[PDB]
């Protein structure tokens, strides 16, 4: 089998970014890479898979993720 | 002009149509392609239910706007 899998990140605006990542790489690497891409900061957004928050130390294997799984990313700011 | 039809299956079908030809034709076309019917499906533009007798003109549609498809329903 493959050491790695493909994961996608979908934002509210419909944008999708796809990452190739090792099954045992902490997902913090993916989140930082997404932040760099979109020019945002980690504290500005949250990542969720199957409705559960993704922790920086969580790996694809630990979350039992599969090839082509999509992660949903949410911005935390609110107007007042 | 060009008009996009956003479906519920993750896909978008794009059609070119005159500014004054009823969308009734576009509807039965999309349905014809996805093997759907029109009793089961409804269409909306910017949130408003579309009538079959509407053209892109009176609904002030422009180039590359989007039509949204939805499964007919009602609560009870």
């Amino acid at each position: 089998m493959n050491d790695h899998i493909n994961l996608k990140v979908a934002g509210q605006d419909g944008s999708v970014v796809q990452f190739k990542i090792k099954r045992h790489t902490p997902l913090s690497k993916l989140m930082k890479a997404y932040c760099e891409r979109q020019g945002l900061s980690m504290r500005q957004i949250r990542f969720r898979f199957d409705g559960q928050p993704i922790n920086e130390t969580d790996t694809p294997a630990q979350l039992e993720m599969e090839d082509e799984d999509t992660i949903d990313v949410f911005q935390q700011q609110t107007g007042g | 002009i060009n008009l996009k039809v956003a479906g519920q299956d993750g896909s978008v079908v794009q059609f070119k149509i005159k500014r004054h030809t009823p969308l009734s034709k576009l509807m039965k076309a999309y349905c014809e392609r996805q093997g759907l019917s029109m009793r089961q499906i409804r269409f909306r533009f910017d949130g408003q239910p579309i009538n079959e007798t509407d053209t892109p003109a009176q609904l002030e549609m422009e180039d590359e706007d989007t039509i949204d498809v939805f499964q007919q329903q009602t609560g009870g």
């Binding site: - | 479906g7 059609f15 070119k16 576009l26």
Partner: peptide, 21 residues
């Protein structure tokens, strides 16, 4: 008259990034 133009993903992959290194 109707004419088909194209059919594609509603949310296409915009960019691919490789984290294997």
């Amino acid at each position: 008259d109707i004419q088909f133009v194209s059919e594609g993903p509603l949310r296409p992959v915009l960019e691919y990034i490789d984290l294997v290194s």
